[PDB]
Coordinates of N, CA, C and O in Angstrom, one line a residue:
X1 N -6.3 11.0 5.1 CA -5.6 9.9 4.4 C -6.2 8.6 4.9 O -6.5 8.4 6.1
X2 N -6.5 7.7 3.8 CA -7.0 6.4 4.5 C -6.7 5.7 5.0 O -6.9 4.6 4.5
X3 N -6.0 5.7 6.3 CA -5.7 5.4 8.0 C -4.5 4.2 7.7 O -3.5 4.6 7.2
X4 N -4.7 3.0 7.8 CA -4.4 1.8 7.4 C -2.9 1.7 8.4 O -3.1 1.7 9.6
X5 N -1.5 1.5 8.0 CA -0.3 1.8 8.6 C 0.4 1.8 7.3 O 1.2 2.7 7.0
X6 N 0.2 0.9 6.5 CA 1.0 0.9 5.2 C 2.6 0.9 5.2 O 3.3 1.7 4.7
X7 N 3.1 -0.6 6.0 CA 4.5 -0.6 5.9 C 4.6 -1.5 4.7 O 5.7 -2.1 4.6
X8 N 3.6 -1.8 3.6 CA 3.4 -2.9 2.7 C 3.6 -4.0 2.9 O 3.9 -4.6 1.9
X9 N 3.4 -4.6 4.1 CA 3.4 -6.1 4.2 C 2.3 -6.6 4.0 O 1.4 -5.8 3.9
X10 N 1.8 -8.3 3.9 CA 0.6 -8.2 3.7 C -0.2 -7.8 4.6 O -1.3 -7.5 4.4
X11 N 0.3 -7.8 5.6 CA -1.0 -7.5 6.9 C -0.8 -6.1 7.9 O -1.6 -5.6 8.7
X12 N 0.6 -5.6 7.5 CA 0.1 -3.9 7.6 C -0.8 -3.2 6.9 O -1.8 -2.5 7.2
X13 N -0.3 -3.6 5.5 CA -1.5 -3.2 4.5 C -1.6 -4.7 3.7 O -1.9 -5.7 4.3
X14 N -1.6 -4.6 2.9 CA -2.0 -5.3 1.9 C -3.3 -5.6 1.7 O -4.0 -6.5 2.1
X15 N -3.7 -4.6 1.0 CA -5.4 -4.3 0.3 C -4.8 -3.0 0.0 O -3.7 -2.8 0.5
X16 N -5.8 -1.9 -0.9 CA -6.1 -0.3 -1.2 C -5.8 0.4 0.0 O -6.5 0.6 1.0
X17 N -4.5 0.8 -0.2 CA -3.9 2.0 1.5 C -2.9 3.1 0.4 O -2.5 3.0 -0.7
X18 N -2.8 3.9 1.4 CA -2.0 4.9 1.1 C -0.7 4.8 1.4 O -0.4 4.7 2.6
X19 N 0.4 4.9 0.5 CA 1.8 4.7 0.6 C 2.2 6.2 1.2 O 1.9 7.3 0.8
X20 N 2.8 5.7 2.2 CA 3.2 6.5 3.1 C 4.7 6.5 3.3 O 5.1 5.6 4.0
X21 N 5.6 7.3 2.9 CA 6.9 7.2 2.1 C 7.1 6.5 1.4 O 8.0 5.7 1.6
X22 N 6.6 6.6 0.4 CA 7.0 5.9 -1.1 C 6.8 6.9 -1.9 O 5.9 7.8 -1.8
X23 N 7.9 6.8 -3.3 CA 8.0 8.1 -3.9 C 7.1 7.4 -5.4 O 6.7 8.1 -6.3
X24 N 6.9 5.5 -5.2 CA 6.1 5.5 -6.7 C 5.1 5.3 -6.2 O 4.2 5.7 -6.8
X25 N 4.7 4.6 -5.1 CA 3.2 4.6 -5.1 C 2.6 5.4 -4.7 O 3.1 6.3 -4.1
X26 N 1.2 5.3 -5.0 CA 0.5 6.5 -5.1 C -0.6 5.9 -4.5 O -0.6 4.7 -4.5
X27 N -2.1 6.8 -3.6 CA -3.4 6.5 -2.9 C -4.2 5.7 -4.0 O -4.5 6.0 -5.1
X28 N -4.4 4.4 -3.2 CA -5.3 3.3 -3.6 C -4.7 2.4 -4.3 O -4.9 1.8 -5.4
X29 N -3.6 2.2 -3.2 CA -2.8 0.9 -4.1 C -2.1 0.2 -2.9 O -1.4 0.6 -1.9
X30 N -2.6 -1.2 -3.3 CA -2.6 -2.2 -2.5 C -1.8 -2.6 -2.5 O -1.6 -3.3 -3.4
X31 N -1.0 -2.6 -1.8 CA 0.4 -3.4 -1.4 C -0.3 -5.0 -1.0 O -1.0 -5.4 -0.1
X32 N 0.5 -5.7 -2.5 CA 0.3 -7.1 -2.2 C 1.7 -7.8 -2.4 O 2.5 -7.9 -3.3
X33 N 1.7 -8.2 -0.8 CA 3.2 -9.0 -0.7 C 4.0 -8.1 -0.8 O 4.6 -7.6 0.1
X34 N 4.2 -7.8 -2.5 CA 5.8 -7.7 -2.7 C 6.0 -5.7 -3.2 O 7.0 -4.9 -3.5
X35 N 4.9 -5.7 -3.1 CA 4.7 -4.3 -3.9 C 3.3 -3.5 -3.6 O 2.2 -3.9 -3.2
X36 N 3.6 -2.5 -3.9 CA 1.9 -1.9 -3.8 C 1.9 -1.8 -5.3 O 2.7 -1.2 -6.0
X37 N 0.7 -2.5 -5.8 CA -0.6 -2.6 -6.6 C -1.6 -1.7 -6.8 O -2.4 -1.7 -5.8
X38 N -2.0 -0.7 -7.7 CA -2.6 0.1 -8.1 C -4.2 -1.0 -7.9 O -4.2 -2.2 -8.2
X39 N -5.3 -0.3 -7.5 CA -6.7 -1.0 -7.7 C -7.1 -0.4 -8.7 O -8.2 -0.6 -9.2

């Protein structure tokens, strides 16, 4: 899985990470701010 922490903040993630309990997002989507964002 690509490592990251992914609590979707901008600076846990925020860029291309893997949602890691989340039932909509899905690998390679960037949580920007407010949401994870598909790249």
């Amino acid at each position: 899985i690509f490592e990251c922490v992914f609590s979707c903040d901008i600076k846990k993630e925020g860029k291309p990470c893997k949602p890691k309990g989340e039932k909509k997002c899905t690998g390679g989507w960037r949580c920007k701010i407010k949401l994870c964002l598909k790249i």
